[PDB]
Amino acid sequence: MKGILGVKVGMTRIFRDDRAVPVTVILAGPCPVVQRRTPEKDGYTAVQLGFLPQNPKRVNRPLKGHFAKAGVEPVRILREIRDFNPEGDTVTVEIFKPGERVDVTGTSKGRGFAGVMKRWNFAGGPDSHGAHKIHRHPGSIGNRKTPGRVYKGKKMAGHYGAERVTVMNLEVVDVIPEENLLLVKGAVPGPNGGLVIVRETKKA
């Protein structure tokens, strides 16, 4: 179990063994170690990692003292990697080698208030043959007098996206330590510029 914080850069494709490989580029390193969580004091094992260094004029006193205890420059993002205890005080892309599999967590793009056709892939209504103002409507939401109510968890229109999403078992295609770049095969949640977390996969 090991992980690193990063930023989604973009998508392209590379050629390998006469095959086109769609990849997502991620700028990951370097992550200073800010705090370590221990079972003796916290009840579990984790490491708090920092990312995206910040102008000191925007750091308030509670955060400045927190950074000063670790002896690091103030960063913008603080995130924990559960069950990880890095050897040094800084985590880099070198922790990953090509061929390894990773899980990537990010915040998916936000669709706002979305209808049942987009949020839940509802069939909707007919577009001709007398259909009356119900083309994108959900249809029936229940039964009669029994039970005379709507179940909890009923699929309805509402906020869609802008939520935490993890994609599992992505293959690491290339590691470029000069520019702190990690290449993973396939697609990663969120927009370009959004924060992501790359961890060793839970699959086997």
Partner 1 sequence: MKTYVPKQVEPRWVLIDAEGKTLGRLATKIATLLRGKHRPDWTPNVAMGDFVVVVNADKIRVTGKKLEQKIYTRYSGYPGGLKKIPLEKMLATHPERVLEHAVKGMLPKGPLGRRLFKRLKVYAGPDHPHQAQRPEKLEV
Partner RNA sequence: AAGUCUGGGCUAAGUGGUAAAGGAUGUGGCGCCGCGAAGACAGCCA
Partner RNA sequence: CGAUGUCGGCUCGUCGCAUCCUGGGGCUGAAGAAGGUCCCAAGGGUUGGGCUGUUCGCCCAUUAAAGCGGCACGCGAGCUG
Partner RNA sequence: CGCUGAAAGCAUCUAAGCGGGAAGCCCGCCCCAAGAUGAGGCCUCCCACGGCAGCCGGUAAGGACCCGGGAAGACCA
Output b/e per residue, 53-68; b: 16+ Cβ within 10 A. Answer: ebeeeebeeeeeebbe
Q: Does 123 bind Mg ion (CB under 5 A)?
A: yes
Q: Does 147 bind RNA (CB under 7 A)?
A: yes
Residue among 197, 204, 203, 183 at smallest CA distance from 46 = 197
Give contact residues for partner 1 (rule: CB under 8 A). 151-153
Q: Does 138 bind RNA (CB under 7 A)?
A: yes
Site for RNA in 43-72 (CB under 7 A): 43, 60-66, 68-69
Stretch of 13-21, 35-43, 55-63, 111-119 contacting Mg ion, by CB under 5 A? 111-119
Q: Does 136 bind RNA (CB under 7 A)?
A: no
Site for RNA in 83-102 (CB under 7 A): none
Site for RNA in 172-201 (CB under 7 A): 190-194
